[PDB]
Design a binder for this molecule. Sequence first.
Ligand SMILES: *Cc1cc2c(cc1C)nc1c(=O)[nH]c(=O)nc-1n2C[C@H](O)[C@H](O)[C@H](O)COP(=O)(O)OP(=O)(O)OC[C@H]1O[C@@H](n2cnc3c(N)ncnc32)[C@H](O)[C@@H]1O
Ligand SMILES: [Cl-]
Length: 385
Amino acid sequence: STHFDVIVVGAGSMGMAAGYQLAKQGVKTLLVDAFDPPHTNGSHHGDTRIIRHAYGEGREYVPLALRSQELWYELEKETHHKIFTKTGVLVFGPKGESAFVAETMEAAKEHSLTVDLLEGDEINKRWPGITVPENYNAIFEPNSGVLFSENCIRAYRELAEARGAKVLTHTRVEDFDISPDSVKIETANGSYTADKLIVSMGAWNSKLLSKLNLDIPLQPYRQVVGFFESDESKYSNDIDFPGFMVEVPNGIYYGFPSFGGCGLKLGYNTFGQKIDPDTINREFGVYPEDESNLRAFLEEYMPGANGELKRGAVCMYTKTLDEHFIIDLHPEHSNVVIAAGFSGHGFKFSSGVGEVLSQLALTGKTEHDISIFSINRPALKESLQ
Ligand SMILES: *Cc1cc2c(cc1C)nc1c(=O)[nH]c(=O)nc-1n2C[C@H](O)[C@H](O)[C@H](O)COP(=O)(O)OP(=O)(O)OC[C@H]1O[C@@H](n2cnc3c(N)ncnc32)[C@H](O)[C@@H]1O
Ligand SMILES: [Cl-]
């Protein structure tokens, strides 16, 4: 016997941010999650997340990256939880052989971002612990950095609840009942109604959006990361070792400097096992590529951080065909908002997306230009049942 103004299904990276934005405006919101955010079953754990401004995936992402950065700084001031550390982010690759590096440089240029350009030995000299061939070039962004993702969701939740938002945990939404003037969700713990619905179930979007008559290609991928014992005199955040995302002949890798001696963290971005969020094996090391792919990179580019494995984590990417996000209203229901397919690089934007989702749910529009994330774009191959 309780109606809400807005219901958010999937209170993760995007959903909890949306809940915070809605709650702050006095909007009666209900957030429902299959677990208890932040948790280790979705796509937000692993402790840290890189945030970049100069965007190699496309310069059209810069505006939202900058707005998100400002929002992260605001969150830092609103909670006791640590939110962001300005490690700066280094991007490098073979000269003339990386579209990612090239677009990163062009994005910085087009938006007048503050960055350093260096190559060959200059990279090795500036950052002891990095060893790249002389034919490698790079762009360093000193003002971007590292976000503590679990703290972000935890802070957004605590703030949202303090303002009246209700969070229903360990409740898996199984179906949706949408009408022209209301929305209703079904769960093992009961049904709820509201005026608007926000759908942000991460990897599970690939299995439940069909319940909304949507047939959009979304592939979940098993993506691991490892923390390795490193030479702290070189890889510690304290000695300014940067966060990074680089492209080498065999793919794209990303990493973080050691924080308080937790060890350098590394991940392989271009490769992962195709999986189902309900049957994925979340144990690190069950595939010999888990650890081998990482050490193959370390022994060649950051030899001093190829020590004993301290910790491992298994997480998920949810890719769209063009690897661009999906942030839009449901084509058949203006009272339903969709957030999906962040394709492995959406957390840094979660703060900004929360704001966008709030605007879409309340007004059906947003001040941000989200055209590249249209649910109707061709490269997506979207359709109905
Ligand atoms: C996996 C990964 C991703 C990643 C990364 C490293 C790894 C190993 N590093 C990143 C980085 O350095 N910078 C960056 O910008 N992004 C990076 N990423 C990607 C980012 O983490 C993902 O894009 C992001 O987390 C996507 O957010 P989203 O909100 O989509 O996913 P979620 O956080 O998993 O939240 C979904 C929630 O919904 C719930 N759920 C699922 N099904 C249901 C049902 N049926 N009912 C109710 N709730 C449901 C989940 O429980 C989850 O909490
Ligand atoms: Cl993702």
